[PDB]
Every structure is written in structure tokens, then in C-alpha cells.
Design goal:
The complex is a heterodimer of chains A (127) and B (6). With 127 residues, chain A is an all-beta fold. Chain A has one domain: Immunoglobulin-like (Sandwich). Helix content of chain A is 0%, strand content 51%. In chain A, a hairpin with a 6-residue loop joins strand 4 and strand 5. The chains are: A mainly beta (127). Chain A binds chain B through residues 53, 55, 57-58, 60, 104-108, and chain B through 1-6. Strand 10 of chain A pairs parallel with strand 1 (4-5) of chain B. Bound molecules: sodium ion. Sodium ion (NA) binds next to strand 9 of chain A. Chain B: The modification Phosphotyrosine is found at residue 6.
Chain lengths: 127, 6
């Protein structure tokens, strides 16, 4: 389609380290979408990580990452960021950014996201 | 309005 979400910033880190992911969105009216991050590890189902409303005024985090991860958006540059700190082996996964059309709302439910990036790999080695 | 989870 004309919509494209491109994640970047993945890599290999040691437990305890930090990493910043970014998603560049094109082909959509970015300020009208809630933006979410999801992740999938081998042999496991894709799961919710974080979401930010279209306005940026509300964020929601999975219990497993609350207090460690921070989601933000830049509506002038059409980007989303996921700052990850205090990384653990259990955070190893492909990380996906996704877009859910609509203002003033946010959801954990993956079926509701119209558009998906292709993912970036984050690998956390045991310290 | 304030944003709501759904
Ligand atoms: Na949607």
C-alpha cells in the first residue's frame, strides 16, 4: 500500500543496557492515528508493549515494561520512538510499530491496528 | 473529552 511504517534502532545489547527504537511513518495522516509498539519472540504470540494516543496526551504500557520503557511521538516529523532501559533477556524479540486510525482512543488489541511495520530485532544477552 | 482505552 501507500502507507509505510519503518522501524529502526534495534541491535544487540547486554542486560542492563538501553536502546532507542524509532519508527518513520509515511503515506498517512499521522496525527490522526494512535501508534503502538508490539513485540514477538520466537515460538510466542505477538504481544502489546506500549501505545500513545494521536494527540500524544496519553500513554499506556504493558505491566512488564512500565517504568523502563517510554513511548513518544513527533507529529511534525511523523515518527514514533520507544526508549528502552534496563533491558533483560525477556525483552528479546522482534519489535513492531503499528498504527490505529482514530483520535482520543487507544487499545492493546492488535486486530484494531490498520498498518504494521516489518519489525526490528532487539537481542539482550545475559550479563 | 479525555482519551479512553477501548
Ligand atoms: Na483501527
Amino acid at each position: 500500500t501507500e502507507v509505510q511504517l519503518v522501524e529502526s534502532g534495534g541491535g544487540l545489547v547486554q542486560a542492563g543496557d538501553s536502546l532507542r527504537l524509532s519508527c518513520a511513518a509515511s503515506g498517512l495522516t499521522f496525527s490522526r492515528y494512535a501508534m503502538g509498539w508490539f513485540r514477538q519472540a520466537p515460538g510466542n504470540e505477538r504481544e502489546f508493549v506500549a501505545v500513545i494516543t494521536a494527540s500524544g496526551r496519553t500513554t499506556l504500557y504493558a505491566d512488564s515494561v512500565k517504568g523502563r520503557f517510554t513511548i513518544s511521538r513527533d507529529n511534525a516529523k511523523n515518527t514514533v520512538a520507544l526508549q528502552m532501559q534496563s533491558l533483560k533477556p525477556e525483552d528479546t524479540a522482534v519489535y513492531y510499530c503499528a498504527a490505529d486510525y482514530g483520535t482520543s482512543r487507544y487499545t492493546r488489541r492488535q486486530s484494531e491496528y490498520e498498518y504494521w511495520g516489518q519489525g526490528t530485532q532487539v537481542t539482550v544477552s545475559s550479563a | 473529552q479525555a482519551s479512553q482505552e477501548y
